[PDB]
Design a protein around this ligand. Structure first.
Ligand SMILES: CC(=O)N1CCC[C@](C(=O)O)(c2ccc(C)cc2)C1
Lengths: 494, 498
């Protein structure tokens, strides 16, 4: 009943069967096996992984069910991580498997997607709610508290089918750390590198466009022409939106793709798809990424793709994580409408020398560290973690969210600490003095009126929210530090 | 001036980096580099490679010229003509390692420039490229005609090569008619002894006993194979690499794989399953080289221009006895089971046998790095159509029965027809030496002669030397047929031809 790390994948391979998607996952794991094994050994050497209880874990991929790319990568990496950490995983990709595993009892943790969660509620019936606190819900784009709370969402006039699960929003697991109301899960970036001679290996004038679908290339000719002034333009398109000068390789194997990326100086974003793995994979191969700037930023308010998504988060660019957490020289964020910004970026990139780069949180060891911490430390099944010693209170100005204020102090909003900031005497300890006070059910409180020292406190604890700016008042905001290149975990959270 | 073997690929990689087309060829060479380097050194140690003249060699790939309408997509092994791309890469590699001075061309402009610049001693070119060569050079193209070596997968038979005879026979193909020495055509497999076999190298770098993998990347190849596949599926999982509605739902698709990933899938696979199409090509040999058995659809009756649209217009009447005749005849059981798909019993017994077989990776010597180096080096040093070889000492005359070709009669003696010797068999005096006495004789311009009527001791001799032909059966008479031995696993070369 204690967990032991695994260092061989044969059992994993036998458990991942009967779906095309798992065939693809098995191949990526085989490519990545040596990296994985080194990382689990390296982690266990640096950090105490003794005396962990072996958990029985349901992994339900609603995505692969009949009754129902980055999601499949994340699933694979989560499964791999759980297996290496020594947990007892029950993989389900059908209603029948879901029924049996749950019907068998002793499940202690449930990893599931949004489509799988509807299936869980239906299959289990009313008692699904008895397992609520064990759910970890892979949800790429994130769910904000305002949408997660079914009655509040309705009260706010939201007309989406999504959200309304009434979970602790930290139970939503996201693709990138864009939504501090949620937990960041992420994935691992594949890299097969060479890393010294990379500038010799690279064909200095070779660009590769990101975008397998012809429709994504609609209206990018001028942009591409600028790029083509300095660089060959290559593509992998499965073609009447593609300029005649494009060297279209079509569908390439993973191994042929890796070769092409090895030789590529610049991976070119068109604007869509949003926030995938592929720009990080190019950067991991020493490519620069030209990242379309979205001014105005894209959200449910102006973009069809985002209408109905249970979040008001806005995207500042095609890949905001790349833009903000990586930046130059690897990533050049440019407005496609500004021909001069594009041109200068391309010229700079041509004259740059860059090394393969991967943020630590997207390596094997990084992901193992993160998910191990969540498994060992995150518990929503009691009345904890992160430790209160990590709390640093900041005051957001009007029109500024708790998300924003923590960010600009080089911190991150930590929603589990809202509870510690929700009454007069607790405020005093953080240099915040309440003259007058009152309770409201709103995502925007706890709030502070600095004119007349008035404190408004949260009266529906499910509505605590990093997201959201007070139009008039200041917000009192819970922040925490993070381990560098590992934003999911405070310094004292291992 | 003398050739030196090369043991490093940096110059080759620089040359090939000059055209986008060569990208995938560079990758295949990198995977295969160590094998190639060992083979060139091994050959030079076993066999005398000193004192070879370094040659200036044009390599013109008509296939890759914009004007032929090819696409960059088709330059990848996974999206293009597997055989042709592989062969070009392996020929270039071989020439580089042997120390020759290679001038690669993939455009009209480059062809014009390299030939426009004098000095070429040997020309490797495809059929599309040959039409291009004639225009770029003008009438003096004939001055280089003897230096041509024409990569032509499926082969050109003398009957089609001879433009006026072809027309006299009513053939309406646009192909053939080059009036070359037919040994100047270089084929993918040794199916056409009127031509030379060039071939290629099979790359080679756990096994699930009940795993079969179907050969056929496109849905259309799977049309009407359900009963065949169902039989296979009775004993084995059926996997695919397809990149949908002809494929049974039990099939386990892996999608597009290449490199180490495809090799891994093959190493794991017990049986590689042929559907009937495509014909020949490298893929079955690559599976066999990774320890897979190959289920090889038998064509009864054999496929040719007479019954199959694909073969119409091809400058040859060669028939295919199976999807992969080389695999059938030159490899055979236990690695290759040749079965009629329409015969449920044959298929089932094959599949059961294969399940219970234990077999090793296998590759005939001619498809190894060292084998191909040996072959192409011999051609370069010994084959000359300009100014003998093979030596006359290798000639063994046989008499083909009526309805039997010179190709066939040599084959059944474990020999191969050797067209350069026909000239030594073409008049009364020369016949006597081979137990053939001519009472009466006459000359005819026919692919089928020299012929012998044994009833009335009548000899018909060849009056157009360009019509000598291994291919072709006399419906009435016997043929006098030139045969030669070969080095084992190396059918291109007689025992005394190194
Ligand atoms: C990488 C490659 O050359 N590929 C991708 C898989 C499909 C392919 C074909 O069918 O021609 C093929 C070739 C060879 C074998 C043994 C199996 C499959 C082509």
């Amino acid at each position: 009943s204690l967990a032991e790390i695994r260092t061989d994948f044969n059992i994993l391979y036998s458990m991942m069967k009967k779906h095309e998607e798992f065939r693809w996952m098995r191949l990526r794991i085989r490519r990545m096996a040596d990296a994985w094994i080194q990382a689990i050994k390296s982690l266990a050497e640096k950090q105490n992984l003794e005396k962990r209880k072996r958990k029985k874990v349901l992994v339900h991929l609603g995505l692969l069910t009949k009754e129902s790319l980055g999601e499949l990568v994340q699933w694979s990496d989560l499964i791999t991580s759980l297996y290496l950490l020594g947990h007892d995983i029950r993989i389900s990709a059908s209603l029948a498997e879901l029924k049996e595993i749950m019907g068998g009892g002793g499940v202690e943790l449930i990893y599931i997607d949004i489509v799988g969660l509807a299936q869980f509620k239906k299959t289990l019936g009313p008692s699904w709610v008895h397992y609520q606190c064990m759910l970890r819900v892979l949800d790429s784009f994130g769910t904000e508290p305002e949408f997660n709370h079914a009655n509040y969402a309705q009260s706010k006039g939201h007309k989406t089918p999504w959200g309304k699960w009434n979970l602790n929003p930290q139970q939503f697991y996201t693709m990138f750390p864009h939504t501090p109301d949620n937990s960041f899960l992420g994935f691992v970036v594949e890299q097969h590198l060479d890393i010294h001679h990379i500038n010799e290996i690279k064909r200095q004038n070779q660009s590769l466009v990101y975008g397998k679908v012809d429709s994504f290339w609609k209206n990018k000719k001028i942009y591409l022409d600028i790029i083509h002034t300095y660089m060959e333009v290559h593509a992998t398109v499965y073609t009447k939106n593609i300029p005649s000068y494009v060297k279209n390789h079509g569908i390439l194997s993973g191994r042929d793709l890796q070769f092409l990326l090895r030789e590529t100086k610049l991976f070119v974003g068109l604007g869509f798809p949003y926030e995938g793995p592929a720009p990080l994979e190019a950067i991991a191969n020493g490519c620069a990424f030209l990242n379309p700037k979205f001014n105005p930023p894209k959200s449910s308010k102006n973009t069809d793709f985002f209408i109905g998504k249970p979040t008001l988060r806005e995207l500042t660019s095609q890949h905001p994580y790349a833009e903000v957490f990586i930046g130059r020289p690897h990533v050049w964020t440019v407005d496609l409408n500004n021909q001069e910004e594009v041109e200068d970026a391309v010229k700079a990139i041509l004259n740059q020398k860059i090394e393969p780069y991967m943020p630590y949180e997207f390596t094997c060891e990084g992901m193992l560290q993160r998910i191990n911490a969540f498994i060992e430390k995150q518990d929503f099944c009691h009345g904890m973690w992160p430790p209160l010693s990590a709390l640093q209170v900041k005051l957001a100005e009007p029109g500024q969210s708790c998300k924003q204020v923590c960010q600009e102090s080089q911190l991150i909003c930590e929603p589990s600490f809202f509870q510690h900031l929700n009454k007069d005497k607790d405020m005093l300890k953080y240099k915040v003095t309440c003259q007058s006070s009152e309770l409201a059910k709103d995502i925007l409180v706890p709030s502070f009126d600095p004119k007349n020292k008035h404190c408004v406190f949260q009266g529906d604890l499910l509505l605590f929210s990093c997201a959201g700016a007070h139009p008039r008042h200041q917000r009192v905001c819970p922040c925490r530090d993070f381990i560098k290149g590992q934003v999911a975990l405070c310094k004292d959270c291992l």
